[PDB]
Amino acid sequence: KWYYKTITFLPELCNNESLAAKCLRVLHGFNYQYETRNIGVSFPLWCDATVGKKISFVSKNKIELDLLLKQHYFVQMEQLQYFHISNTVLVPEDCTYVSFRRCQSIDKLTAAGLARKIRRLEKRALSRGEQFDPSSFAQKEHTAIAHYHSLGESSKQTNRNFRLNIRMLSEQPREGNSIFSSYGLSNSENSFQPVPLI
Amino acid sequence: KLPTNLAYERSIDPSDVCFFVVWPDDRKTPLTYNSRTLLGQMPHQVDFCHVPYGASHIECSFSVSFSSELRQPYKCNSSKVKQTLVQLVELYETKIGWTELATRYLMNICNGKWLWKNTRKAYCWNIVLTPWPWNGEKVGFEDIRTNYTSRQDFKNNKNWSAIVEMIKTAFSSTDGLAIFEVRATLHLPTNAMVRPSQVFTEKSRVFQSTTIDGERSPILGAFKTGAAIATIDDWYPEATEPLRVGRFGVHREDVTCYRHPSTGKDFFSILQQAEHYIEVLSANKTPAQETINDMHFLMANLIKGGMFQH
Amino acid sequence: VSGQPIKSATAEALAQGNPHQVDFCHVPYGASHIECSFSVSFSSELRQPY
Amino acid sequence: GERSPILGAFKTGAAIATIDDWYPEATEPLRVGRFGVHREDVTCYRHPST
RNA sequence: CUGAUAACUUACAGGACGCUUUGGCUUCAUUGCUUUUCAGGUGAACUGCCGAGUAGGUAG
């Protein structure tokens, strides 16, 4: 009971992570004008290097899906032929279902990240009682992480240029209606809702 | 010339630059680094070595040993070029003494050139070197960014006229020795990037490390700390920067080599002009254009020398 | 021997660092000293030939 | 169960037997061979000609 | 355009009986492998919040 409009990156020489990020940033520029969190992420040909050539925006009622692909970025990037839009096809009844959850537990492993964690643990050691020695906090030793295909986003009301990193793990075709965030998503704190990978 | 067996032994024997983190409690712990190996879905090991949170400052320790193994060649083969080189050394020692090379070799020990990139985004770094044989205190230096910059700043009363001698009396005297124990205190900012030496990886950023107190610590090379204190050569056709005192004067970062045999300034056009350079050092007066600049390089290359065979 | 070669020893081709694999041994940090032990034996096997 | 460097059995026999300074002129003790061979200066003194 | 032209060799079969290779033996003197070495993250993936947290979550 879902619709999906695929957009595919044409011109032979492009960084898909650099462009998919901008598409998600346009989706973040969207839906802080209208109070909704309904639109998907859905990377169909997600490889183990360079998240692939197209991106679809899976959602419900579809009166707010069509409006996202006429935002004068997609139209301007369709005029000069770099994108190619599919005209709102219903999802087929037999599909593979994946969750594109933003982990946010990889930027908490980096040295600047775990220092920030320790420095927050310092600040809430004033739940009184003499506090931890910061010498007894080691950069584990031999960490291993997979796979997370990191995209390059940035904040607007500050000059932080964060980045979000997303993994592909798949499960249990349907639960939710729909919820799942302003960066599309399959993470946001309650809804681990499958997206059906058009 | 080049008598099919002419090897030398190095005079300057540097050691590994061991890192230590000192705390506000005034106790020293070994610096530790993590290794992020990527695990692509159905080895690429990347290391990161940052200063841990709440650390007072960092201490880098190494021991350098100036010896007298440039007088006699190791294996000469022929006893015609043997007295040539020995005569050329003692004539150089007699005419224009070891003060210049001693100063050039000690200046880039006493300003933290052997840290390479740990001076970058550093508030202050203080060097304390203990010489041997010595009869007094530790020769300690102040903040080396404002104080000690030029040659004249290093030429202060109680810390230059006594440690250039013992290097001059090392290179001159037979079996002469000078063992300097150098300790440098880096005042780095909160979570500052420490850059140690990396392994070869014959085929991304795996660090060179050794075990201290049962845990691995970064090392900053054994040869990456001898190739820093021997960045002297600025006697090549025109002049740009101090290079590594090599045979063909090879620049590393820029891929080309200045002082190349087409120019005829390398350590084969100059070594084969030995018989000329004994004639020039006879009487007055040696010019500082193409004689002293060449003799400096000759001796700077004889200190590093081995092995000259063809 | 003993001229100059053809342009195979070019300036870009003499800045190509050649790798060695050598055994490095050093005194570990925080050691008191090194202790070297062996045994020698003087005998009377020069009186009569073997 | 740890490999360690050894300095050799035959090298330290060629250390405790560097006593030969009874050779045509004299400078330093050589290794006691037959043909008074010197290692550094590759030419051997005490040759069958002398 | 061939020493040309033409061309059915076929039936049946029991190698078996027996066997001691053995005696003796000293490889051992002497030994220096050594000289010299830059692997290279331009600044860059941040700052918060919830949580008893080297657990786990979260916004931008």
Q: Which bases of chain E come closer than 7 Å to a protein CB?
A: 29, 31-41, 43-54, 56-60
C-beta of residue B192 within 8 angstroms of C-beta of residue C9: no
**B3 CA from E30 C1′ (Å):** 32
Two tokens at B109? 């020990």
The A 11-40 residues near strand E by Cβ under 7 Å are 28, 32
Radius of gyration of chain B measured on its C-alpha atoms: 22
What are the DSSP E strand ranges found in A39-177?
54-56, 89-90, 101-102, 144-145, 150-151, 164-167
Closest listed residue to residue C14, CA positions, set B187, B251, B2, B19: B251
Torsion over CA: B305, B310, C3, C6 (sign): negative
Closest listed residue to residue D20, CA positions, set D39, D42, D48: D39
Nearest to C19 among B15, B200, B251 (CB): B200
Name residues whose C-beta falls within 8 Å of residue B254's C-beta, 6 or more positions apart in sequence: none
Closest listed residue to residue B78, CA positions, set B26, B189, B3: B3
Do D and B make contact, counting contact as 3+ CB pairs within 8 angstroms?
Answer: yes
Q: Which residues of chain D have a CB within 8 Å of the CB of B73? A: 40
Q: How far is CA A80 from CA A10, A11, A19, A76, B54, in A?
A: 11, 11, 15, 7, 54
The B 66-85 residues near strand E by Cβ under 7 Å are 74-75
Residue C9 has a CB neighbour count (10 Å cut-off) of 13
A147 CB neighbours strand E below 7 A: no
C-beta of residue A196 within 8 angstroms of C-beta of residue A97: yes
Q: Give the integer Cα–Cα distance in Å for C33 and C31.
A: 6
- Which DSSP symbol is given to B184? E
Before B67, cis peptide (omega within 30)? no
Phi/psi of residue B294, nearest 5 degrees: -80, -45
B305, closest nucleotide (Cα–C1')? E36
Q: Give the integer Cα–Cα distance in Å for B156 and B182.
A: 19
**What angle do helix axes B292-304 and B81-95 make, rounded to 10 degrees?**
120
Q: What residues pair up with B128 in beta bridges, in sequence order? A: B140, B183
**A135 CA from E41 C1′ (Å):** 26
- Which DSSP symbol is given to B7? B
**B31 CA from E60 C1′ (Å):** 34
Q: How far is CA B222 from CA B180, B196, B226, B228, B301, in A?
A: 16, 11, 7, 11, 19
Number of residues that make up chain B = 310
Q: 3-class DSSP state for residue B28?
A: strand
CB-based burial, B11-43: b 16+ in 10 Å, e otherwise: bbebbbbbbbbebeeeeebbbbbbbbeeeeeee
Q: What residues pair up with C47 in beta bridges, in sequence order? A: none
PDB experimental method = cryo-EM
Two tokens at B3? 């008598």
Two tokens at B100? 């210049």
Two tokens at B22? 């000192």
A124 CB neighbours strand E below 7 A: yes
Torsion over CA: B270, B274, B280, B282 (sign): positive
Residue B191 has a CB neighbour count (10 Å cut-off) of 16
